[PDB]
Amino acid sequence: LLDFQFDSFTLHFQQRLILTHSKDNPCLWIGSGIADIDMFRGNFSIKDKLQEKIALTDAIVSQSPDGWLIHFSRGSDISATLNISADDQGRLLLELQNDNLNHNRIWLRLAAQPEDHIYGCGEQFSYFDLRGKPFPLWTSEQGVGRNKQTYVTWQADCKENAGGDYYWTFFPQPTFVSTQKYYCHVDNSCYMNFDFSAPEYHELALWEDKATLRFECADTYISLLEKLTALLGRQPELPDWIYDGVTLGIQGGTEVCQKKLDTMRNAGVKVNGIWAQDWSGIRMTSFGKRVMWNWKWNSENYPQLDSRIKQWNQEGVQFLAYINPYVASDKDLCEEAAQHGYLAKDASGGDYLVEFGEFYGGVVDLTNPEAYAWFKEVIKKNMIELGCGGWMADFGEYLPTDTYLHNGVSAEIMHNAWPALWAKCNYEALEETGKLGEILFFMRAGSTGSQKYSTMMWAGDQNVDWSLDDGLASVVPAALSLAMTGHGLHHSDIGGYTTLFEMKRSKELLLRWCDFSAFTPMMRTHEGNRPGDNWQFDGDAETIAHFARMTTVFTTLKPYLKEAVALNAKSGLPVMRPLFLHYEDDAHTYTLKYQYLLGRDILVAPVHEEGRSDWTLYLPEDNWVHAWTGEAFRGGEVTVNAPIGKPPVFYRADSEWAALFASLKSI
């Protein structure tokens, strides 16, 4: 189980070499720094002012009750302790504590092999295999473009550092899987940087004076994910109605929603819902219309919505809304918050207001237990009691680092923990009203614990483009990285979101994205931030009939998806899966980024480029049947015709669901 051999030492854990240390090749450095943060409205620029970094070359080992205690030191005056133990469940527990609080930097090297791959670290959009690169772990806006060599990224960076880079995300997490078949989970929420660049070791940098790391091994990845999710959390089963069609993203009030619902339904589209983020009203800005950030039904913008929700529910249509953890400073909720001390504060003791351009929002202080209770009641009374079937629970990634919080923990530490705290507020609202498995909320931000508390992740803001780092393609590493970090329910905005700098959503992008989303567990559209510039679900008859066809595809898969979702809830086996979960012996499957398995038996490789008439993907060794033609294929690279509406989807001839899958092509 734990094999500690000892000047120099080695620690093996179920035969994986975890730590090696000598005077000449230490495993531990400590020191100190000052965080140098430029927030840029959530587009954080975060770097160190490094003061010291000192190698703790000397170690003295004692036997401990639980396991081992290593005293690391350098000279007479600098030291740290590392306790090594099994935890309650047999996980390897490493507990590091620096000599004093002033040494707020740790660098720890974990032994590795040059061939190892590494997956996880939350939701990663440019890399799935993380080997070869470093990953700062700091929740932020995800970036527009995300690649310093693309034009959109350069444009966004000219304005508020908004372009981002390959590691930017709203759901980074200090949790990874190695192909030595273990996971490592770090309890801290400070800034960290996980460096997977060096062939012989991983280096984990923490901006704290202490660290706690836990490891478990397993015989298979599937077992590993079961263990990881026993640690972090498992999601609920989705409500049954999620499988019944597309949720239409509509703004502009009750009657606009009505007309669009009818147009789609009368053309044969399977529609399970309407998601109207302007349920709370419309705020005019110099850049067009924004949602009004006060979380109560606005009967001026949505007349008769209370009775309309009932009528829609009678016809099999749920109503979904929107909430975030800020409150518009000129409206009711924020005044109430200001009166009861429910807002975060600034250094001078005033209520902290964040600028979102011309308008401001108070930051709800979720570490204040009365503010938390209060905001949960807002959810219960203003959304659940109104009859909402779900909502977007947006933001979480932008707790400013110069807030002062009720629990007295530094915002430098609370910033990364904010998303799962927000998620818990939502989850408890449902738990307390008996609505788990009936109401569905979806989030973009996350952190450790979102695995229990977020009932569905969405991929946040993609560009309305075909880029690798911020377009349709980027959703696939996002799903797969999350899957390997223990969250197995994931979807994206059908057609993407970010409509800036002359990017506008084509019909072709919308239809290709619809083809992708019909092979995921949830179908939901978005108008984008500039709705008039984008092609929408009702743009013409061909678009509408396309939605009719692919929503019929999606609804036909219902029982298969429902089985997959039940496995996710039961054992953390995610719905969209890396191919190596089922083809472990196939070396090629470890480096794939842009294809996945939907449950066990369907392989999907979404077309993510403009102007394609065919598509090339990889099949591992199995008996595959192309969904649309019934052509049989074996293992290897394959190129197939891929017109819109016939995405590159294959299923296993031997699946017990083969008769359901054979029926797809005659829809």
Residue closer to Cl ion, measured from CB, 110 or 619: 619
Its sign, for the CA torsion 597, 598, 604, 610, is negative
Q: Residue 383 phi/psi, 5° resolution?
A: -115, -55
Which of Cl ion, Ca ion, none is residue 367 near (CB under 5 to 8 Å by kind)?
none
Q: Which does residue 215 touch among Cl ion, Ca ion, none (CB within 5 to 8 A, set by kind)?
A: none
Residue 583 sits in the site that holds Cl ion (CB under 5 A): no
| Residue 582 in the binding site for Cl ion (CB under 5 A) | no
Query: What is the rounded distance in angstroms from the CA atom of residue 181 to the CA atom of residue 183?
Result: 7
Nearer to Ca ion, 73 or 492 (CB): 492
Is there a catalytic annotation at residue 622? no
Q: Residue 143 in contact with residue 90, Cβ under 8 Å?
A: no
526 is in an annotated binding site: yes
Give the nearest distance from C-beta 303 to Ca ion in angstroms: 6
Residue 375 or 594 having the CB closest to Cl ion: 594
* Residue placing its CB nearer to Ca ion in the complex, 173 or 492: 492
Residue 329 touches which of Cl ion, Ca ion, none (Cβ within 5-8 Å per kind): none
- Closer residue to Cl ion, CB minimum distance, 130 or 569: 130
By CB under 5 A, tell whether 461 contacts Ca ion.
yes
Tell which positions 171-230 bind Ca ion, by CB under 5 A: none
User: Token pair for residue 191?
Assistant: 């800034």
Query: Is 177 in contact with 118 (CB distance < 8 Å)?
Result: yes
Q: Which of 203, 278, 397, 469 is catalytic?
A: 397
Our CB check for Ca ion shows the closer of 43 and 142 to be: 142
Contact status: 490 vs Cl ion (CB under 5 A): no
Give the nearest distance from C-beta 571 to Ca ion in angstroms. 32
- Give the nearest residue (CB) to Ca ion: 461
- Segment contacting Cl ion (CB under 5 A): 140-148, 218-226, 425-433, 588-596? 588-596
Q: Which residue type occupies 187?
A: D
Is residue 461 flagged as an active site residue? yes
The reply to whether 194 sits near Cl ion by the rule CB under 5 A is no
Is 293 part of any known ligand binding site?
yes
Q: Which tokens in the block code for residue 499?
A: 């409509």
Size of the site for Cl ion (CB under 5 A): 3
Residue 4 CB-density burial (10 A; 0-12 exposed, 13-18 middle, 19+ buried): middle
203 makes contact, choosing from Ca ion, Cl ion, none, with CB < 5 to 8 Å by partner type, with none
Smallest gap from Cβ 299 to Ca ion, in A, equals 7
Selection from Ca ion, Cl ion, none that 592 binds (CB < 5 to 8 A by kind) is Cl ion
Q: Which is nearer to Cl ion, 191 or 596 (CB)?
A: 596
Number of residues that bind Ca ion (CB under 5 A): 4
DSSP string, 71-130: EEEETTTEEEEEEEEE-TTS-EEEEEEESSTT--EEEEEEE--TT--EEEEE--SS-SS-
Q: Give me the count of residues in the chain.
A: 667
- CB neighbour class for 636 (10 Å; exposed up to 12, middle 13-18, buried from 19): exposed
593 belongs to the binding site for Cl ion (CB under 5 A): yes
- At 556, which amino acid appears? T
Stretch of 265-273, 430-438, 465-473, 505-513 lying at the interface with Ca ion (CB under 5 A): 465-473
Pick from 326, 594, 651, 661 the residue near Cl ion by CB under 5 A.
594
Is the C-alpha dihedral spanning 146, 150, 154, 155 positive or negative? negative
- Residue 142's binding partner out of Ca ion, Cl ion, none, with CB under 5 to 8 Å set by partner kind: Ca ion
Closest CA to 426 of 464, 478, 372, 472: 372
- Write the interaction track for Cl ion spanning residues 536-575; mark x where CB under 5 A is met and - where it is not: ----------------------------------------
Closest CA to 608 of 489, 485, 466: 466
Report the C-alpha gap between 314 and 45 in whole angstroms: 50
594 makes contact, choosing from Ca ion, Cl ion, none, with CB < 5 to 8 Å by partner type, with Cl ion
Using CB under 5 A as the binding rule, the residues of this chain from 89 to 148 that contact Ca ion are 142
Question: Which partner, Ca ion, Cl ion, none, binds residue 538 by CB below 5 to 8 Å per kind?
Answer: none
Alpha helix segments (H runs only) across 396-506: 411-433, 450-453, 475-483
In one letter, which amino acid is 572?
G
Q: Is 470 in the site for Ca ion (CB under 5 A)?
A: yes
Give bridge partners of residue 321 from the DSSP assignment.
391
Residue that the structure tokens 């996971």 belong to? 183
Residue 350: which residues within 8 A CB-CB, separation 6 or more?
Answer: none
254 contacts Ca ion (rule: CB under 5 A): no
- Give how far the C-alpha of residue 640 lies from the chain's centroid of Cα atoms, to the nearest Å: 31
Neighbouring C-beta atoms of residue 445, cutoff 10 Å:
29
Binding window for Ca ion (CB under 5 A); candidates: 69-77, 192-200, 327-335, 453-461: 453-461
**600 marked as part of a ligand binding site:** no
Q: Are 382 and 296 in contact (CB under 8 A)?
A: yes
Residues 6+ apart with CB under 8 A from 335: none
- 3-class SS of residue 34: strand
- Which among 208, 461, 469, 470 is annotated as catalytic? 461
Sequence-separated (6 or more) residues with CB below 8 Å from residue 307: none
Q: 89 vs 616, which CB is nearer to Cl ion?
A: 616
| 304: three-class secondary structure by DSSP | coil
Q: Which is nearer to Cl ion, 214 or 593 (CB)?
A: 593
Q: Of these partners, Ca ion, Cl ion, none, which one is at the site of residue 593 (CB under 5 to 8 Å by kind)?
A: Cl ion
Residue 213 to residue 202: CA distance in whole angstroms: 14
In the residue annotation, 358 being an active-site residue is answered as: no
The pair of three-digit structure tokens given for residue 259, joined into one six-digit string: 């007309």
Which single residue brings its beta carbon nearest to Cl ion? 594
Q: Distance (Å, rounded) from C-alpha 330 to C-alpha 332?
A: 7
SS3 content of the chain, % helix, strand, coil (to 5): 25, 30, 45
Nearer to Cl ion (CB atom), residue 383 or residue 592: 592
Burial of 488 (C-beta count, 10 Å sphere; 0-12/13-18/19+)? buried
Which of 208, 244, 365, 394 is catalytic? The answer is 394
Partner whose binding site includes residue 189, from Cl ion, Ca ion, none (CB under 5 to 8 Å by kind): none
The answer to whether 251 is annotated as binding is no
Q: Is 592 in the site for Cl ion (CB under 5 A)?
A: yes
CA distance 27 to 106: 11
Task: Give the per-residue contact string, 294-323, with Ca ion (x = CB under 5 A; - = no).
Answer: ------x-----------------------
Residues in contact with Cl ion by CB under 5 A are 592-594
Residue set of the binding site: 277, 290-291, 293, 526
Residues in contact with Ca ion by CB under 5 A are 142, 300, 461, 470
- Catalytically annotated residues: 394, 397, 461
